[PDB]
Design a protein around this ligand. Structure first.
Ligand SMILES: CCCCCCCCCCCCCCCCCC(=O)OC[C@H](COP(=O)([O-])OCC(O)COP(=O)([O-])OC[C@@H](COC(=O)CCCCCCCCCCCCCCCCC)OC(=O)CCCCCCCCCCCCCCCCC)OC(=O)CCCCCCCCCCCCCCCCC
Ligand SMILES: CCCCCCCCCCCCCCCCCC(=O)OC[C@H](COP(=O)(O)OCCN)OC(=O)CCCCCCCCCCCCCCCCC
Ligand SMILES: CCCCCCCCCCCCCCCCCC(=O)OC[C@H](COP(=O)(O)OCCN)OC(=O)CCCCCCCCCCCCCCCCC
Ligand SMILES: CCCCCCCCCCCCCCCCCC(=O)OC[C@H](COP(=O)(O)OCCN)OC(=O)CCCCCCCCCCCCCCCCC
Ligand SMILES: CCCCCCCCCCCCO[C@@H]1O[C@H](CO)[C@@H](O[C@H]2O[C@H](CO)[C@@H](O)[C@H](O)[C@H]2O)[C@H](O)[C@H]1O
Ligand SMILES: *C(=O)CCCCCCCCCCCCC
Lengths: 20, 171, 170, 103, 453, 547, 155, 119
């Protein structure tokens, strides 16, 4: 929960879209 | 653990010693020591053993009130100022087995006699062990008293560490 | 033997003896024994050694580091220029440490030398020590173990901005 | 409250061995078998030379030519100057104090 | 560094190609020669480090650790060759090879210029270490926890830093370091960059693997573990803190509290330890808690003290394990109270016990005291109140150091122990090779003060 | 200057030579103790030459010969302060040690480790001279902790005896608690000033010196066994008698006072610190003098006598008379060392009996030990014109006429009366009366080593105070005007103490039973502080450590 | 040694008590485990909380300095109760009276020192007088700033 | 002394305060007061390296004694008269401070008497 809230605020990608 | 007699005699000695610490001077101690003996002689022939125990109990409570906070202690007694002073100087005899032969050669006569004792120890061990087996009831000893040697030529069982213990002033 | 300007000593003034007694002074007879027994043989041995050093004379030099551009002139992330500025700043940092050490030794020598009158007679040395310690503190204090020319420059700019802001306030 | 005959006998037997053991700790005449005012002045003279004179030569050499050759290594408290004194370095004479009130 | 890597590698062919009975003579003689040449690394400059190539470098921090590492290998060989006497030849040679490969990884670890190269070698040191302790030891959760909470997060953080900064070369990071701004993601980067080193120090609260490890390890394993392996954590933190500012200002607080309190706790525990090897292991936790504090407050004085403490502890703690091992090889027990009054039976070995104890309690002017003093001065500026905790720790340390000396060396000897043979020349030489260099470093302390000097 | 400095250092170097030659270099095990005694004898002579030069012209030196380490802006050099305090103390310490070493040659004759004993005594002396000549705090700390370690090794000399080891560890414990204050002072001076050198500390002369001086006072409390950290000094009697003589006179115990004397330029201006040191000294001198009134071990009485005198020195610090405190150090060394050697003479002749209740009747049986004991006792009690009168009497006058804490002044005067009582106690029970010792009489003091060592200290306890006080330059303005009842207070309270003590000691011969009052038990058991504290604190710490 | 002869978990049924008591060379009546709380004593016996100093010094102990016999169960806190550490011997004065007397003495002294500070002794004299403006320059005063003079007169 | 019983048990208003005094002008009741003369100069006391607490109105006698003590070495008994002159001068100095205390005491008593008289 604390991590999930942190990721929402910081925009941490779970399944990050390929970029490079 | 101690009989009633042994407790009365141990209090008598302890009371006298603490009295000595108070009086200091020998004439004064002699006077009060005789009064203390007269107190022990007052109830010497007490038959009622309930009365006698009560007398001993009160005696020990009176002793606790009257004891010296700093009684005299013989220098080498436990708690004395020389107690265990020389323990650092007591080296066990088995250390001699590890001497370099050049160290042993400075004392030929001593180390020759030392072999004889080691031989005497080895040849006696089996008979000492056998003696203790045939005198020990089934279940092991009930006390720590050891027996003497009962034949001629036998040595009392478990003698080595008593006979060859370090001297009290080893240097 | 050393630069008397860098490590100054005031002129010495020993008073001439004025003995008002008739007993001989044992310290004068021990001085002559010392000169005869200790000093002279020691001097002879040294004179022999110095003769050998004279036969073989060779020299060493004090390394001179040319000046290179400061960290203020280095472009961001330009390691080649930053490396030379950083190394120079470290050399200057080490030299400033020894400058403070020189001024501290002046102060300490003055205290012992002036004796009971040191509180009044060492005012100049105390004042100079006070100023140099301030300047050293401004340059280098509070930088941390990972100090650098960059962090020193950032500290300077913070101080300069505060001074500029205080000048306007006045 | 005495020894039982058993206790008496064991102590006697241990006593005999202990005394024989103690006697055997005595050294024989040959053991240990080792491998192969003038005097009062000599020791004091040799001791003075090796422990005072030689160290003072080393120390005096050390201080004179290595320690005092560096700045502020040996710092003297400057000599006291009293009125009336004469300074060797310059020859200056220090004027006497004023005249005291009678006391 | 190739002048040290290659000869160290050649110790392996030497050991395997040596005559059957010369394996200890050849490996010890030639590892001492390598240790001798390691003094060439003391070509250190006031401004620049000694940068050999694109892979390896040596500053004033890694040099003393390198010299300590290369000195320890010959000492470990002497300490081991008695209890490995009955092992067969091939297992003797395999044990020596493990020690050589551990030195090979260590010297490269302390000189790796790139942090990811450091990380790989930093983890390779565990392979020979665990083999040594298990295969020649006396008789899971921490491996799993350490990798989960230490090793793996460190790998991700280093890889992340390289993507962002573009490099992990330590020289490059000195010029491209950017400040770490407050953010939840940076809090995890900070912890990911430090937890692997804190576990290895160990940090108080993460320390219970160390007494367990020392109890199981053979003498050589305890020597390298106590002298060098713990200092990988200290060395790693001294390097990686370069790129963690200014976030270290507040992130250090919980770890400073753990160390300052942990100092007193582990020192106190030493008073009640019944096993010598556990007592020394807890003593190391106490000493290393001072190094953690010194690294975290990062002042010039604390870094000089931290470097001296790491070197001084390495010699002292290693010497204490060797002293305890010399008793174990006679009485075959680690219990401290079992064999007492040993000064009566082994007079010279009691002198080693005294000297080792005196350095352990940091008697001036030993480098144990110099390092400890510098940290005490630096933490006093950090907060004057810390002097109370530091002072109390000095008291308790002297208590357990002298308690260990008094319990084993003084009092009456134990009657029934009659196999206390005189000290061998091998053991006396081993002790003097710890304490002589340690006491000689008092004459020239500047070479173990690190790059902040 | 060249002869002054060379001879100052050769005094120290000469003392390390017997240690250096222990590494097989013409080392004569034959008579190593005699070799070490001769070195002390020659070191004393060479140290007299710099002292004479200082007495003459007041010459003073700082020798910073060797540069050891530079930590940025902090240079550490091996530096020696050959000043007033060093020039007077070193000759006194060497003179006393010379006698203690010659005494030890007879006292420790049978000890199989006689050579190791003299090595330790010599190391004890070297580490103490490092302490007193130190010019920087780090160098002082080397000597400070060096004497502490040598006390541990010498207190626990008979290491097979459990009480010896306990007493030795106790000394380390209490001294290390004081060393918290020592490192506190070092940390403050480095941070606030930028130095550990005494010269720069006195030149900057900080005004907010409460914290550094509290730290220094705490260090003095442990090392000089002031109240709170005092129990270790009486327990140090576990060591052989020569150790106590050196520990209690010219080493260890006075290092705490010496540290505060060296920092008088700072304490001169801190009235808060003067108050604290005054009160601490007053309770120490009174409390330990009370404990000595009921002790029966002759070495414990003299140990509590030292603590009481150390308290008086601490009082002198607190009234801002650092030079009188130093003079008491020097005078006290002469007769306190002699008293321990007289006690060892008695103890040796009665086969290691130390309880005065088993002595008596020795006045005629040991005439030379008796003479030294009476001379030593009279010096201690401030008998006019003996060595002790030239410091103690001035200290009482200075305290009487000072702007001072009144209760502290009172406690100090009472302790002066108590000094007479426990001095009377030793003389009465040891020398007078009838023999109370065993029947096989082995009393013999006709050994030249015994007579000569005591004799040199007996001469010291007669004229040293007069000789020293007439050579030292004045550094204060002594208070010489006061009412007759303040001028003679020390003499009166000392005489009343003798009168009171003789009455009580003569009551012991009456044929009347004797019951213990709460006050008697309080004195006998040292105010209960060791009993409560040495069981409670070890229990609390040890019990929490396991869990 | 075997697992049966090593310490075990807290004993539940009385039969485990008998086996534990024989393991520790004690009779079943004397054997008593520690409370079955969470500490982790197991079935290790709880023995009297007495220092080794209280044991008879004249008996021929197998360990004279520890006053222990071979095979006899060791107190859990034996290393705290050795003769070098915590003593629990009877004292001639009751423990509570010792504490009150000691604390009463320290409290009284600290109080009197406070009183002595508030009413200090001193002699009937005025302040000591110094020349040259109370030695303004000697005390380090600024020579460029003129000091406000202090004047002393005869009496 | 008795003077402490007065201040602490009796009336402190009429007893001098050692820290505060003098609390009256130095010329009150004193028509034309001569200043104390200092014989030794600042340079002389500086050059002699007198301790600061010794640099009082008797310093010139101390300077004289210290010079004699230096010129008579090794005779450490040769300057008794000079030592006494310094000792006596300090005695006169102390008496002056005793008079200052007494003068302040009588003035405080005088102030008390007037206040009653004005009341
Ligand atoms: C290039 C150079 C290469 C490196 C060479 C380094 C030197 C090597 C020394 C070789 C010695 C060979 C020899 O013959 O041994 C003689 C020496 C005596 O021979 P022994 O008669 O058979 O007795 C030896 C027994 O172990 C019994 O010995 P012990 O019990 O008599 O000695 C115990 C003593 C051991 O300590 C000593 O070694 C005495 C000297 C202390 C200094 O313990 C202490 O005293 C510790 C406390 C010392 C107080 C500390 C004072 C503060 C520090 C002051 C620093 C100075 C600042 C200025 O043997 C040893 O003691 C071996 C120890 C060698 C370590 C020396 C460490 C110095 C400390
Ligand atoms: C769980 C923590 C995961 C951290 C995370 O995923 O954050 C992502 C962040 C970089 O991703 P980014 O795209 O830059 O997000 C914006 C940042 N302001 O991540 C970072 O910037 C740095 C990531 C460092 C690696 C951390 C790995 C997790 C270890 C945390 C615990 C370590 C201590 C053991 C407990
Ligand atoms: C706070 C400090 C704490 C210190 C703790 C450590 C304690 C260590 C023990 C103390 C040692 C004291 C002795 C110091 C002298 C030895 C060192 C030395 O002498 O240095 C060389 C000397 C010049 O000294 P220098 O090198 O210039 O000083 C800077 C060093 N960084 O130049 C010379 O030496 C030349 C001397 C010539 C000798 C002539 C006599 C012949 C030799 C006789 C013996 C063989
Ligand atoms: C006023 C100015 C001073 C202010 C400071 C006051 C603080 C001091 C308080 C006292 C501290 C406790 C000291 C205990 C000394 C001690 O226990 O050692 C002696 C004791 C046994 O000795 P003994 O009683 O003589 O018995 C043998 C004779 N049969 O030995 C033992 O039995 C146990 C030995 C091991 C000791 C373990 C316990 C350590 C004590 C706690 C240390 C913690 C650090 C304290 C420092 C606080 C200061 C910040
Ligand atoms: C320089 C002068 C020094 C003087 C020091 C004086 C202060 C120190 C002594 C304080 C004693 C206080 O004692 C306090 O009261 C009494 C005894 O007094 C004690 O308690 C008990 O003492 C005695 C003996 O059992 C009983 O008669 C009393 O009835 C009872 O109360 C308390 O345990 C203690 O709290
Ligand atoms: C008068 O000349 C002053 C000097 C006299 C000393 C006074 C004696 C001590 C007083 C005790 C009272 C306690 C109150 C704190």
């Amino acid at each position: 929960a604390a991590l999930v809230k942190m990721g929402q605020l910081e925009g941490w990608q779970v399944f990050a879209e390929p970029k490079v | 653990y101690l009989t009633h007699q042994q407790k009365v005699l141990r209090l008598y000695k302890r009371a006298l010693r603490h009295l000595e610490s108070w009086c200091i001077h020998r004439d004064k101690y002699r006077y009060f020591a005789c009064l203390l003996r007269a107190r022990f002689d007052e109830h010497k022939n007490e038959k009622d053993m309930v009365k006698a125990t009560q007398l001993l109990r009160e005696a020990e409570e009176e002793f606790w009130h009257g004891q010296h906070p700093q009684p005299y202690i013989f220098p080498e007694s436990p708690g004395g100022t020389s107690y265990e002073r020389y323990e650092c100087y007591k080296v066990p005899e088995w250390c001699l087995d590890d001497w370099h032969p050049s160290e042993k050669a400075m004392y030929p006569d001593y180390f020759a006699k030392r072999e004889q004792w080691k031989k005497l120890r080895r040849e006696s061990w089996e008979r000492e062990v056998k003696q203790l087996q045939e005198e020990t009831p089934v279940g092991g000893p009930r006390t720590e008293a050891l027996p003497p040697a009962r034949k001629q030529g036998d040595l009392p069982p478990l003698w080595w560490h008593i006979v060859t213990r370090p001297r009290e002033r080893p240097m | 033997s050393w630069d008397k300007d860098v490590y100054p000593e005031p002129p010495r003034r020993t008073p001439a003896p004025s003995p008002q007694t008739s007993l001989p002074n044992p310290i004068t007879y021990l001085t002559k024994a010392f000169d005869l027994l200790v000093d002279r043989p020691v001097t002879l041995v040294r004179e022999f050694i110095e003769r050998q050093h004279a036969k073989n004379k060779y020299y060493y030099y004090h390394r001179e580091f040319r000046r290179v551009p400061d960290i203020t002139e280095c472009q961001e992330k330009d390691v080649l220029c930053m490396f030379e500025a950083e190394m120079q700043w470290r050399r200057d940092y080490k030299v400033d440490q020894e400058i403070v050490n020189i001024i501290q030794e002046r102060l300490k020598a003055c205290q012992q030398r002036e004796g009971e009158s040191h509180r009044q007679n060492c005012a100049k040395e105390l004042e100079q020590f006070t100023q140099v310690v301030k300047a050293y503190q401004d340059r280098y204090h509070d930088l941390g173990a990972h100090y650098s020319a960059r962090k020193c420059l950032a500290k300077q700019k913070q101080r300069m901005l505060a001074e500029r802001k205080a000048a306007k306030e006045a | 409250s005495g020894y039982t005959p058993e206790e008496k006998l064991r102590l006697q037997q241990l006593r005999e061995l202990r005394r024989r053991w103690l006697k055997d700790q005595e050294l024989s005449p040959r053991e240990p078998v080792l491998p192969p005012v003038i005097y009062k002045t000599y020791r004091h003279s040799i001791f003075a030379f090796t422990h005072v004179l030689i160290p003072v030569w080393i120390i005096h050499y050390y201080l004179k030519y290595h320690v005092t050759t560096k700045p502020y290594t040996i710092v003297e408290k400057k000599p006291r100057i009293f009125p009336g004194d004469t300074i060797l370095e310059t020859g200056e004479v220090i004027p006497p104090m004023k005249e005291f009130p009678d006391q | 560094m190739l002048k040290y890597i290659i000869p160290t590698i050649m110790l392996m062919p030497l050991t395997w190609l040596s005559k059957n009975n010369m394996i200890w003579v050849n490996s010890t003689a030639h590892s001492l020669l390598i240790s001798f040449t390691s003094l060439l690394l003391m070509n250190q400059f006031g401004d620049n480090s000694l940068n050999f190539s694109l892979l390896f470098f040596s500053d004033s921090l890694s040099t003393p650790l390198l010299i300590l590492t290369m000195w320890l290998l010959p000492l470990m060989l002497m300490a081991s060759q008695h209890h490995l006497s009955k092992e067969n030849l091939t297992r003797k040679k395999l044990f020596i090879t493990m020690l050589i490969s551990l030195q090979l990884f260590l010297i490269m670890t302390f000189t790796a210029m790139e942090l990811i190269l450091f990380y790989i070698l930093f983890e390779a040191t565990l392979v020979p270490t665990l083999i040594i302790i298990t295969r020649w030891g006396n008789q899971g959760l921490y491996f799993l926890f350490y990798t989960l909470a230490g090793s793996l997060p460190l790998l991700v953080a280093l890889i992340y830093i390289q993507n962002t900064v573009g490099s992990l070369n330590f020289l490059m990071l000195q010029y491209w370091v950017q400040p770490v701004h407050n953010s939840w993601s940076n809090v995890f980067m900070w912890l990911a960059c430090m937890m692997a080193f804190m576990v290895k120090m160990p940090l108080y609260g993460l320390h219970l693997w160390l007494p367990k490890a020392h109890v199981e390890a053979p003498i050589a394993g305890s020597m390298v573990l106590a002298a060098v392996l713990l200092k990988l954590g200290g060395y790693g933190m001294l390097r990686i803190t370069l790129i963690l500012n200014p976030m270290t200002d507040f992130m250090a607080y919980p770890f400073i509290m753990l160390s300052l309190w942990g100092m007193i706790m582990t020192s106190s525990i030493c008073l009640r330890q019944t096993d010598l090897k556990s007592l020394i292991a807890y003593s190391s936790v106490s000493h290393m808690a001072l190094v953690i504090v010194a690294i975290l407050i990062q002042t010039p004085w604390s870094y000089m003290g931290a470097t001296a403490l790491m070197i001084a502890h390495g010699l002292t703690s290693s010497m204490l394990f060797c002293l305890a091992n010399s008793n174990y090889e006679r009485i075959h027990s680690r219990t401290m109270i079992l064999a007492r009054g040993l000064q009566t039976l082994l007079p010279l070995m009691a002198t080693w016990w005294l000297l080792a104890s005196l350095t352990n309690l940091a008697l001036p002017p030993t480098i144990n005291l110099i390092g400890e003093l510098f940290v005490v001065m630096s933490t006093f500026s950090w907060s004057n109140i810390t002097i109370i905790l530091m002072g109390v720790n000095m008291v308790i340390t002297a208590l357990y150091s002298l308690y260990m000396l008094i319990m084993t060396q003084r009092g009456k000897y134990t009657y029934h122990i009659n196999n206390i043979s005189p000290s061998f020349t091998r053991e006396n030489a081993l002790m003097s090779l710890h304490i002589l260099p340690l006491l000689l470093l008092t004459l020239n302390p500047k070479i173990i003060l690190g790059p902040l000097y | 200057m060249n002869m002054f400095s060379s001879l100052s250092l050769v005094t120290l170097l000469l003392l390390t030579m017997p240690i250096m030659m222990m590494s097989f270099n013409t080392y004569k095990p034959s008579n190593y103790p005699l070799y070490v005694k001769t070195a002390i004898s020659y070191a004393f002579i060479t140290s007299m030459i710099p002292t004479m030069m200082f007495i003459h012209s007041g010459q003073e030196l700082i020798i910073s010969n060797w540069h050891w380490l530079t930590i940025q802006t902090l240079k550490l050099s091996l530096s020696f302060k050959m000043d007033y305090f060093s020039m007077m103390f070193i000759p006194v310490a060497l003179f006393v040690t010379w006698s203690i070493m010659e005494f030890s040659m007879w006292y420790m004759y049978s000890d199989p480790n006689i050579n190791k004993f003299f090595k330790y005594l010599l190391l004890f002396l070297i580490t103490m001279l490092i302490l007193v000549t130190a010019n920087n705090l780090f160098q002082l700390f080397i000597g400070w902790e060096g004497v502490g370690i040598m006390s541990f090794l010498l207190i626990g000399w008979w290491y097979g005896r459990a009480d010896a080891n306990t007493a030795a560890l106790q000394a380390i414990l209490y001294n290390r608690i004081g060393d918290i204050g020592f490192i506190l002072a070092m940390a403050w001076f480095l941070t606030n000033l930028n130095t550990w050198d005494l010269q720069q500390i006195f030149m900057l002369n900080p005004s907010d010196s409460n914290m550094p001086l509290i730290g220094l006072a705490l260090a003095a409390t442990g090392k000089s066994a002031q109240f709170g950290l005092h129990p270790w000094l009486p327990s140090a009697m576990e060591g052989p008698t020569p150790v106590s003589a050196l520990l209690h006179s010219s080493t260890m115990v006075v290092a705490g006072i010496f540290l505060l004397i060296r920092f008088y330029p700072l304490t001169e201006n801190n009235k808060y610190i003067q108050s604290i040191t005054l009160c601490l000294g007053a309770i120490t001198t009174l409390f330990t003098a009370m404990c000595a009134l009921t002790q029966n071990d002759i070495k414990k009485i003299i140990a509590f006598s030292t603590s009481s005198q150390l308290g008086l020195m601490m009082v002198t610090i607190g009234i801002n008379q650092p030079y009188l405190a130093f003079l008491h150090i020097c005078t006290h060394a002469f007769f306190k060392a002699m008293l321990f050697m007289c006690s060892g003479s008695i103890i040796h002749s009665l086969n290691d009996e130390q309880d005065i209740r088993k002595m008596g009747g020795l006045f005629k049986a040991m005439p030379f030990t008796t003479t030294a004991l009476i001379v030593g006792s009279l010096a201690l009690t401030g008998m006019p014109f003996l060595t002790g009168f030239y410091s103690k009497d001035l200290i009482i006058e200075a305290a009487n006429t000072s702007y001072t804490n009144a209760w502290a002044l009172l406690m100090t005067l009472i302790a002066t009366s108590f000094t007479a009582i426990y001095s009377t106690r030793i003389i009465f029970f040891a020398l007078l009366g009838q023999p109370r010792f065993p029947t096989l009489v082995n009393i013999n003091e006709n050994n030249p080593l015994l007579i000569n060592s005591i004799k040199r200290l007996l001469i010291g306890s007669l004229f040293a105070g007069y000789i020293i006080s007439n050579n030292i330059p004045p550094t204060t303005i002594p208070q010489m005007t006061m009412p007759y009842y303040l001028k003679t207070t020390a003499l009166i309270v000392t005489i009343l103490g003798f009168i009171l003590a003789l009455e009580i000691s003569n009551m012991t011969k009456n044929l009347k039973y004797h019951y213990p009052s709460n006050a008697f038990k309080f004195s006998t058991l040292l105010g209960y502080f060791p009993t409560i504290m040495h069981r409670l604190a070890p229990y609390m710490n040890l019990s929490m450590s396991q869990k | 040694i075997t697992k049966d002869m090593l310490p075990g978990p807290y004993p539940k049924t009385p039969e485990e008590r008998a086996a534990a008591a024989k393991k520790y060379n004690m009779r079943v009546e004397d054997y008593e485990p520690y409370p079955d709380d969470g500490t982790g004593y197991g079935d290790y016996p709880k023995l009297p909380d007495r220092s080794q100093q209280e044991r008879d010094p004249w008996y021929d102990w197998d360990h004279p300095d520890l006053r222990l016999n071979w095979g006899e169960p060791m107190h859990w806190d034996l290393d705290m109760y050795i003769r070098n550490r915590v003593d629990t011997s009877p004292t001639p004065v009751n423990w509570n009276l010792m504490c009150k007397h000691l604390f009463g003495f320290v409290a009284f002294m600290l109080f009197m020192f406070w009183v002595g500070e508030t009413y200090p002794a001193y002699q009937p004299v005025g302040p000591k007088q110094y020349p040259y403006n109370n030695l303004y320059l000697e005390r380090g005063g600024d020579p460029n700033k003129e000091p406000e003079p202090v004047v002393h007169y005869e009496i | 002394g008795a003077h402490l019983a007065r201040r602490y048990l009796g009336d402190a208003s009429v007893e001098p305060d050692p820290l505060r005094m003098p609390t009256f002008p130095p010329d009150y009741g004193f028509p034309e007061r001569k200043e104390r003369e200092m014989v030794a100069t600042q340079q002389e006391m500086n050059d002699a390296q007198l301790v600061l607490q010794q640099r009082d109105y008797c310093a010139h006698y101390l300077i004289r004694f210290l010079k004699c003590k230096r010129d008579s070495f090794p005779n450490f008994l040769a300057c008794k008269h000079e030592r006494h002159d310094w000792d006596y001068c300090e005695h006169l100095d102390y008496v002056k401070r005793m008079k200052e205390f007494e003068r302040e005491r009588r003035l405080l008593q005088r102030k008390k008497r007037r206040e009653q008289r004005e009341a």
